[PDB]
């Protein structure tokens, strides 16, 4: 009854979760759905217990009564005394990234260009840049701004999915899961690296982790950081070292959500599971690492050091922050 049912989004996450379930001696077991929204429905129905979510998905889940349990914490700079599990999270930087060779593309000349998004409804990929664009254009027709896009989750016949590529067989175009070649932070950055799009909306860490040999994956292995620039809201372009002064927003960290009635038990099982399979886990890398997936960010971001306790038993609006919840609410007025 202490068994926790994780929800895997698509078949790559399902494989990873089945490995975790075998290694955990079924203390964790797996349900799978094709999209994050479908996993949120399985948790609402009580057919799964928990999954990790981007902050835009935490807004969907929290409007439905699910609660944040633990947050991803990556490597920090201040508070190094404090154990990872007890350290306040820092947010991550939402950025707009372009190629250096695409000279004279700036924030102010994005109209009619090609865009790459992590997925509809996600923080850096969609809520932050589209919220900003709707506000600045004074128009809700955000499906007409870029000439073509990959925005997984949108209608596959629309311009918002025109650049999406589907799976190895070219099926599942635009699905919001890792089967879509251009899904998520890594897929939207690959869409820009391959010059399918002109801009990608990702986070600062994705640029660094997929350049300069930080990834050995085939499409990333030869990318150089200096070949990219960030688009700043004042119309300037900066090197990717300057994200602290050239971002679109600071996003709340991805976090595990559950029904309120199972939160305490999900929390206790995850704190034990990361002791085993987390960053310096007893059985990681020997048997299984919960926070690696060959850069694919399956079930958790690969840069995750631990899942950390939340201060103040926060509601989902307190965890997201009032600035971000208000930004989302305004954007969702459009559709």
């Amino acid at each position: 009854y202490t068994r926790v049912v994780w929800c895997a989004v698509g078949p790559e996450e399902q494989k990873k979760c089945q490995q975790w379930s075998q290694q955990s001696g079924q203390n964790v077991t797996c349900a799978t759905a094709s999209t994050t929204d479908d996993c949120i429905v399985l948790v609402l129905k009580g057919e799964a217990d928990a999954l990790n979510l981007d902050g835009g998905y935490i807004y969907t889940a929290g409007k439905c009564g699910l609660v944040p349990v633990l947050a991803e914490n990556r490597k920090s700079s201040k508070h190094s005394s404090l154990d990872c599990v007890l350290r306040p999270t820092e947010g991550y930087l939402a950025v707009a990234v372009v190629k250096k060779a695409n000279e004279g593309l700036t924030w102010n000349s994005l109209k009619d260009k090609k865009s790459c998004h992590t997925a509809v409804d996600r923080t850096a990929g969609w809520n932050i840049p589209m919220g900003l664009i709707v506000n600045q254009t004074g128009s809700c027709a955000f499906d007409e701004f870029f000439s073509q896009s990959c925005a997984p989750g949108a209608d596959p016949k629309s311009r918002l999915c025109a650049l999406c590529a589907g799976d190895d067989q070219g099926l599942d175009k635009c699905v919001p899961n890792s089967k879509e070649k251009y899904y998520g932070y890594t897929g939207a950055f690959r869409c820009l690296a391959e010059d399918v799009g002109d801009v990608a909306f990702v986070k600062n860490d994705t640029v660094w982790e997929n350049t300069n040999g930080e990834s050995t994956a085939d499409w990333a292995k030869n990318l150089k950081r200096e070949d990219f620039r960030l688009l700043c809201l004042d119309g300037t372009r900066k090197p990717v070292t300057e994200a602290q002064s050239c971002h679109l927003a600071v996003a709340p960290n991805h976090a595990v959500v559950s029904r309120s009635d199972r939160a305490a038990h999900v929390e206790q099982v995850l704190l034990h599971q990361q002791a085993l399979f987390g960053k310096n886990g007893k059985n990681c890398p020997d048997k299984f690492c919960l926070f690696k997936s060959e850069t694919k960010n399956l079930l958790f971001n690969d840069n995750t050091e631990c899942l950390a306790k939340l201060g103040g038993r926060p509601t989902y609006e307190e965890y997201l922050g009032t600035e971000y919840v208000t930004a989302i609410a305004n954007l969702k007025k459009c559709s």
Partner: peptide, 6 residues
């Protein structure tokens, strides 16, 4: 403001 999407 107020409704779960499902």
């Amino acid at each position: 403001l107020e409704a779960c999407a499902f």
